[PDB]
Amino acid sequence: PVANADVVFDFQNYTAKAGDEVTVDVLVDSKNKPISAMDVKFKVDSPLTIEEIDKESLAFNTTVMTNMAILGANFKSLDDKGEPLVPKDGAAVFTLYVNVPANTPDGTYYVGFNGKNEVHKSNDGSQFTVASKNGAITVGT
Torsion sign (Cα): 21, 63, 27, 45: positive
Q: What is the distance in angstroms between the CA of the first residue and the CA of the last residue of the chain?
A: 25
- What does the alpha-carbon distance between residue 71 and residue 52 come to, in Å, rounded to a whole number? 9
User: Count of domains in the chain?
Assistant: 1
Residue 140 Cα distances to 19, 86, 137, angstroms: 11, 38, 10
Q: Compute how many other C-beta atoms are within 10 angstroms of the C-beta atom of residue 133.
A: 15
Q: Compute how many other C-beta atoms are within 10 angstroms of the C-beta atom of residue 63.
A: 11
- What does the alpha-carbon distance between residue 111 and residue 50 come to, in Å, rounded to a whole number? 9
Method: X-ray
- What does the alpha-carbon distance between residue 51 and residue 53 come to, in Å, rounded to a whole number? 7
- What does the alpha-carbon distance between residue 10 and residue 81 come to, in Å, rounded to a whole number? 29
Q: How buried is residue 46: exposed, middle or buried, by Cβ count under 10 Å (0-12/13-18/19+)?
A: exposed
Q: What is the resolution of this structure in A?
A: 1.1
Helix or strand or coil: residue 40?
strand
Show the domain range for 42. Answer: 1-141
Domain of residue 70, CATH code: 2.60.40.680
